[PDB]
Amino acid sequence: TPEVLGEDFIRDPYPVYARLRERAPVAHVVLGGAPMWLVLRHEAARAALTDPGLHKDPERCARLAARHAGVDAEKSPGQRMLVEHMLGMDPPHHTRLRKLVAKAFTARQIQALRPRIEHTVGALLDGIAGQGEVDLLKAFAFPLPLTVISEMIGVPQADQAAFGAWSNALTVAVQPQEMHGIADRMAEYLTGLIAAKRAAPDDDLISGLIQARDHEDRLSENELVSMVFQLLVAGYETTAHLIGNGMLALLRHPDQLAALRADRSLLRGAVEEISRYDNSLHLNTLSVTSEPVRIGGVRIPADAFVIVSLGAANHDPERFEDPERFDIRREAGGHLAFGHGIHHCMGAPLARLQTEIAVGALLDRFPRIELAVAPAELRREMNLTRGLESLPVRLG
Amino acid sequence: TXEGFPXGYX
Numbered sequence: 148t149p150e151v152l153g154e155d156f157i158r159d160p161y162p163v164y165a166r167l168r169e170r171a172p173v174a175h176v177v178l179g180g181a182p183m184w185l186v187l188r189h190e191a192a193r194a195a196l197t198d199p200g201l202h203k204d205p206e207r208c209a210r211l212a213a214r215h216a217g218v219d220a221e222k223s224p225g226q227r228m229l230v231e232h233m234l235g236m237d238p239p240h241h242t243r244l245r246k247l248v249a250k251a252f253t254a255r256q257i258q259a260l261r262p263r264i265e266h267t268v269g270a271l272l273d274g275i276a277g278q279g280e281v282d283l284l285k286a287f288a289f290p291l292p293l294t295v296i297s298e299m300i301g302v303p304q305a306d307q308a309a310f311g312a313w314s315n316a317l318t319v320a321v322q323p324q325e326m327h328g329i330a331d332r333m334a335e336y337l338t339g340l341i342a343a344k345r346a347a348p349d350d351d352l353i354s355g356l357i358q359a360r361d362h363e364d365r366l367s368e369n370e371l372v373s374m375v376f377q378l379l380v381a382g383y384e385t386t387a388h389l390i391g392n393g394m395l396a397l398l399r400h401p402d403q404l405a406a407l408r409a410d411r412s413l414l415r416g417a418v419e420e421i422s423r424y425d426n427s428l429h430l431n432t433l434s435v436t437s438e439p440v441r442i443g444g445v446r447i448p449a450d451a452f453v454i455v456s457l458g459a460a461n462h463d464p465e466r467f468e469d470p471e472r473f474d475i476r477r478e479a480g481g482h483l484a485f486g487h488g489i490h491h492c493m494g495a496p497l498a499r500l501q502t503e504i505a506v507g508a509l510l511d512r513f514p515r516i517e518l519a520v521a522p523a524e525l526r527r528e529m530n531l532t533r534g535l536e537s538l539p540v541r542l543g
Numbered sequence: 544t545x546e547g548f549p550x551g552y553x
């Protein structure tokens with residue numbers, strides 16, 4: 148029988164994972180009324196993530212989804228921007244896109260990353276120092292990656308708040324025409340930005356993406372919009388909630404917080420354990436089969452939705468001992484917070500860099516930081532990205 | 544959202 152996964156799962160997924168993962172390495176479940184296959188064990192997850200039988204095909208997903216809702220033309224630029232990126236395609240097309248996007252990074256762009264992150268972190272902490280209590284998400288965890296990614300991409304400072312707010316609104320849309328409307332505005336904005344960098348190339352990643360070439364091959368206008376969008380959003384709320392979840396873990400384990408403050412040689416290991424323990428993404432993006440596939444000994448039929456639970460794999464006792472415990476001194480190497488295989492997260496070094504600097508700088512500036520509320524007052528967002536509604540902290 | 548469906552997640 149197909150276990151129904153609802154709002155309780157969304158808010159608190161790891162106890163569901165602990166019960167299904169013991170039963171089999173893959174579970175047949177129903178998520179949002181859609182039957183699908185949930186890969187749970189670490190080995191099975193690595194195999195699924197390297198299995199060419201799992202396809203990124205948003206068009207087939209749409210067609211299959213229409214069938215489960217029993218319902219059955221020109222795509223708007225928003226519609227296209229949402230799905231015409233790296234995570235929306237398979238090789239060879241995926242190989243080409245990611246070859247070109249990797250060329251766009253210049254050495255100057257990469258080197259400015261660390262100085263820029265420490266300057267933004269600095270500015271943000273100067274703006275909250277003196278307040279007794281702040282919501283660390285709105286005051287720090289969300290603005291930092293918004294700024295860093297926006298500056299790397301080339302979004303002007305005066306436009307950054309608005310792009311962030313549109314991203315939040317895209318994230319909470321419930322109806323396709325609404326989502327498409329938000330996306331259409333975003334795509335229109337990114338079309339203007341791209342036009343201005345064609346006319347006057349700067350030292351930003353948009354200009355790098357326009358100029359990248361493989362002989363005469365280049366990113367089309369469509370691919371540019373979709374990739375600039377994905378690069379802006381893929382690390383915005385994901386980095387913020389990594390920082391949020393990690394700071395929450397650190398505050399709920401004050402001995403390790405103090406240990407980390409006293410010994411920065413534990414910082415790298417602390418960021419790794421944050422990704423393993425409570426990653427902002429416990430699920431990867433939806434995949435669809437075209438033919439039967441074999442994952443963890445479980446046969447999955449053709450025309451099936453397949454989702455890989457990075458979180459369940461990261462909490463797999465076959466791979467990590469005492470996996471429900473947060474322990475920065477652990478060997479957390481080999482987690483799947485950034486994926487695995489051809490779609491492995493392109494931004495993983497940047498996400499690690501921002502998180503390491505942000506947490507380090509927080510504990511340096513605010514030695515007496517603590518939760519400002521009782522844990523029973525915290526709430527998780529009703530969202531596939533694992534994140535808190537707020538993180539109230541007393542800076543002291 | 545980034546496989547073309549409302550409900551966040553891209």
Ligand code: HEM
Nearest residue numbers: 233234381382385386389431432485486490492493494498
């Ligand atoms: C803590 C923050 C982040 C987490 C947890 C994360 C996680 C992931 C995961 C798990 C995937 C694989 C998706 C799948 O297989 O369905 C992925 C892909 C990707 N991520 Fe990240 N990511 C983060 C930050 C970033 C940042 C900062 C960027 C860029 C600014 C970025 C850009 C990308 C891109 C372009 C892909 C697609 C690569 C491909 O499909 O070949 N991510 N991410």
